[PDB]
Amino acid sequence: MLEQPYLDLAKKVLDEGHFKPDRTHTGTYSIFGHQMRFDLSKGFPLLTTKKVPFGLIKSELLWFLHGDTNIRFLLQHRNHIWDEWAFEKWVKSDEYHGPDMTDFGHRSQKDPEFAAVYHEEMAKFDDRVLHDDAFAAKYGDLGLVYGSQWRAWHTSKGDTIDQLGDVIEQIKTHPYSRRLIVSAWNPEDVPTMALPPCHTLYQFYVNDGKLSLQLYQRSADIFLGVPFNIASYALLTHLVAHECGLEVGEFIHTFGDAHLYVNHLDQIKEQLSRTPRPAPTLQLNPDKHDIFDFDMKDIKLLNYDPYPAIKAPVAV
Amino acid sequence: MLEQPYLDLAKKVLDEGHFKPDRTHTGTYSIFGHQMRFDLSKGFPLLTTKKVPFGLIKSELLWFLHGDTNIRFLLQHRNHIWDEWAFEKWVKSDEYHGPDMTDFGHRSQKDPEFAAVYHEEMAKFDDRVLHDDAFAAKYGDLGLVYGSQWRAWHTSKGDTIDQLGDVIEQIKTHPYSRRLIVSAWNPEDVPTMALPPCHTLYQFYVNDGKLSLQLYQRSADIFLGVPFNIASYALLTHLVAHECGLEVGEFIHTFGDAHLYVNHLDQIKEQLSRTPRPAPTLQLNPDKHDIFDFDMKDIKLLNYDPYPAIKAPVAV
Ligand SMILES: O=c1ccn([C@H]2C[C@H](O)[C@@H](COP(=O)(O)O)O2)c(=O)[nH]1
Ligand SMILES: O=c1ccn([C@H]2C[C@H](O)[C@@H](COP(=O)(O)O)O2)c(=O)[nH]1
């Protein structure tokens, strides 16, 4: 099926990957350099061998597409993928007066009752970003996130470039353009960035009326990360195809360091016992066309019949 | 042999590639997304199925490594790969008083005697950059070329980042770093660039004492371009390995648009009749270590026994 390339990557890393130490101190099995393609006319690459929350992937994509960098939009759609970053900044500032929470990500995963004090602490934070319009502007805005990188690349002359926006006008006026690249890797910010872009750069390609996209991802958490990533970009490939009035081609995922954290081997092994189900289909609101003014409801996924989800510890 | 991946890419494009129009108006056969690896411990990937001028590749690499952006260093080592760019700027300025040479690249390939007036014109230019220290600073400096992109990434705060230099200190202090990327794609300069980077970005990787490098190349001229490119980066992988005191791993070449210009089909077809010869070996000056202060003589290639070169028209 469509998602067999994923299952293959995982197998590969299981028996070929070599042990490798890392930033988080959870070890990993790793390979360097890997690529896979998904013919997007065959169906949507949302994994069936495990239940992946599509809702989180699209609320985050639309957050990106809007050029939004404030955690608030996410919280409103009950999406907490980035809270950990906003909270972080907050706990290390003056306004914060409370149970310190230093190196919390670890401690939550390591202590029972701390985890409980931490989430109540976070509970207030999310609610406070959700309600205090000033607090939100102050602690809700991450600044350098894909949205701003994609749509507001700050220049040296103090202005801003709508990188993606320009690229799309280019696909229209020059579909055969070999230079259709959008980049999220800013060399001058990367050294002081808590998390320099994982999805470093991507390129569009047009031929025979079909649009294709290749993504260069420097680091991949094969079990926890890759499944979400695949969906974000295939979705993105469908949106851009929609706007440009082109048919959908393939999504080529290129990898730098594709790894498996040692604390995930039993799970990936289990998922590999499962047979792929037929793939879901993507359905976009035909009446609307400007993808930049797209919202939750203009994107429907039909026929997603996945195996149950698989819990897994996080790496830190 | 080592270079079989190249021969495969070419075959692939021959029967799988689809016709595609382009910038230069010479048509092409193209594929999107392709990757190949070269185990650098097996030998140096300088093609044997065709004689490729290694001298040009290293004088250009050392020009890059020095952070030099002046055509002058090249001319001195009788390397003319970039003259066409300097000349271009010159002919379209005040100081130039002479036989206009508009759209020359084409005309040379299209008219007999114009080609002769053009090269004498260029002859003077190269000599004038080679001798008039002021002319050279004025017309010899291209500005935005890999050297400056690699070593003097201009920031918004007016300063400069030694991108590659930092990355190398990083390989030393944190070889397991997943974030070891050097980038040449500046979003704010790309729109007014005569030729936005073809070699967009590359990443290093360390494990088991071996250093590997993956290159993301957005556009590839399979016949004329790819053979030079492969050598530049494998060489670069050997130099960095030298400095960091690491063994050499693999060179993974990832491609965006890998194409064959229609005006090259008879040649690639001919090269495909040839059987690969054993690969040459690379030999670096052990006494010297700082690759930034490396020059022509500290890099020797032994046992290069290639088939004769293959003339081919250029695309415009
Ligand atoms: O969309 C994403 C974001 C992150 N990661 C993972 C990759 C690594 O497991 C970790 C980042 O590690 P570094 O490369 O920064 O060291 O997060 C993904 O796989 N996909
Ligand atoms: O190192 C290089 C430099 C250039 N090219 C080729 C690729 C294309 O044939 C042309 C650039 O075309 P655009 O992508 O800019 O359209 O030059 C290479 O293959 N390798």
Q: Which H, E and C letters describe chain B, residue by residue?
A: CCCHHHHHHHHHHHCCCEEECCCCCCCEEEEEEEEEEEECCCCCCCCCCCCCCHHHHHHHHHHHHCCCCEHHHHHHCCCCCCHHHHHHHHHCCCCCCCCCCCCHHHHHHHCHHHHHHHHHHHHHHHHHHHHCHHHHHHHHECCCCHHHHHHCEECCCCCEECHHHHHHHHHHHCCCCCCCEEECCCCCCHHHCCCCCCEEEEEEEEECCEEEEEEEEEEEECCCCHHHHHHHHHHHHHHHHHHHCCEEEEEEEEEEEEEEEHHHHHHHHHHCCCCCCCCCEEEECCCCCCHHHCCHHHEEEECCCCCCCCCCCCCC
Residue A73 vs residues A66, A132, A293, A295, B45: alpha-carbon distances, Å: 10, 14, 14, 11, 51
Q: From the candidates B18, B149, B207, which should be mutated to test the interface with A, based on the most A CB atoms within 10 A?
A: B207
Cβ contact B249:B40 at 8 Å:
yes
Chain breaks in chain B (C to N over 2.5 A) after: none
Instruction: Using an 8 Å CB-CB cutoff, list chain A residues near B187.
Output: 153, 161, 163, 183
Structure-token pair, residue A27: 């070890």
The residues of A carrying an active-site annotation are 198
Q: Residue A160: which residues within 8 A CB-CB, separation 6 or more? A: A152, A153, A154
| Distance of alpha carbon B39 from alpha carbon B42, whole angstroms | 6
Structure-token pair, residue B237: 């992988």
Collapsed DSSP state (helix, strand, coil) of residue A107: helix
B248 - beta bridge partners? B211
| Distance of alpha carbon B234 from alpha carbon A24, whole angstroms | 31
B37 - beta bridge partners? B252
Which helix (H) or strand (E) is A33 found in, with range? Answer: strand A28-39
Structure-token pair, residue A175: 């579909």
Please state whether beta strands A18-20 and A28-39 pair in parallel, antiparallel, or not at all (unpaired).
antiparallel
Please state whether beta strands B210-221 and B247-261 pair in parallel, antiparallel, or not at all (unpaired).
parallel
Give all domains of chain A, ordered by start, each with its CATH number: 1-316 (3.30.572.10)
Resolution of the experimental structure, in angstroms: 2.5
Collapsed DSSP state (helix, strand, coil) of residue A65: helix
| Distance of alpha carbon B37 from alpha carbon B49, whole angstroms | 18
Cβ contact B36:B271 at 8 Å:
no
Which helix (H) or strand (E) is A147 found in, with range? Answer: helix A146-151
A163 lines ligand 1 (CB under 6 A): no
From the centroid of its chain, how far is CA A294? Answer: 18
- State whether residue B28 sits within 8 Å of chain A by CB: no
Structure-token pair, residue A301: 């996924």
Collapsed DSSP state (helix, strand, coil) of residue A120: helix
Using a 10 angstrom Cβ sphere, with 0-12 exposed, 13-18 middle and 19 or more buried, the burial of residue B168 is buried
Q: How many angstroms separate the alpha carbon of residue B22 from the centre of ligand 2? A: 11
- State whether residue A218 sits within 8 Å of chain B by CB: yes
- State whether residue A25 sits within 8 Å of chain B by CB: no
| Distance of alpha carbon A286 from alpha carbon A302, whole angstroms | 15
Collapsed DSSP state (helix, strand, coil) of residue A199: strand
Instruction: Using an 8 Å CB-CB cutoff, list chain A residues near B177.
Output: 23
Distance linking the first and last C-alpha atoms of chain A: 33
Structure-token pair, residue B299: 């890099």
Question: Do B216 and A216 lie within an 8 Å CB cutoff?
Answer: yes
Name the CA radius of gyration of chain B, rounded: 20
Q: Hunting for tokens 């130490």 — which residue is that?
A: A21
Minimum CA distance residue for ligand 1 atom 16: B178
Question: Do A218 and B181 lie within an 8 Å CB cutoff?
Answer: yes
